[PDB]
Amino acid sequence: HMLSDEQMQIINSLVEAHHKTYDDSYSDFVRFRPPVRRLSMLPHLADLVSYSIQKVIGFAKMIPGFRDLTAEDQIALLKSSAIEIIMLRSNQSFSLEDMSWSCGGPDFKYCINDVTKAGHTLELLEPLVKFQVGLKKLKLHEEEHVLLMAICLLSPDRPGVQDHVRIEALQDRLCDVLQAYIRIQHPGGRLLYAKMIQKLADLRSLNEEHSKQYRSLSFQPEHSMQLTPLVLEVFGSEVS
């Protein structure tokens, strides 16, 4: 009924990695192409997502064991999971009070209608919002939020990964940390671990729907030209 030295180190590493790659001031948003409220929100949200991918990559590189993987496995894990990590880390700015994502000022407050003006439909956005409120209602500790992100990223069951056994062993270590953390440090958390694993399963369904809608978007050059080179690379279909 106690966390080990190695488990505590892993938590401290992941929390620090998250603080180093998540800006609570949202001060970089003013450097994106501005919001316009045709797909009027596509430039701004493309820039937001591009920025997010960079942060997700920076977080990944500080996950214990991630940098020891092959470059090909690191890419394979990021290409498959980046959209899910973005959905997870967007939960911090999500607000139950008006079902929107508030990133600083009123200009960087996004509702469902804003994302439809970037090319997405309710078939993605309705489950996405229901995902966000259910995740928000979990009231995760920071430690649990960063562990769930790292567990999602280190999933061996993605297309293109080669060292399934090494990646699974890393993910297993993180799950054991999460389970022990909820046991010792999260009061009334009897069913919390199972609820978090279920959230990882919801994310695969969101991933699938977003990929469908991203393909439809990015096959039209008048829209793909509004994306960034990083978005095109990471969400694209090239294989190593």
């Binding site: 990559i57 890419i75 690379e233 990471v234 090239e238 190593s240």
Partner: peptide
Amino acid sequence: KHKILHRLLQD
């Protein structure tokens, strides 16, 4: 291929 990812993954 993956020009930007490879770069960003270096340090």
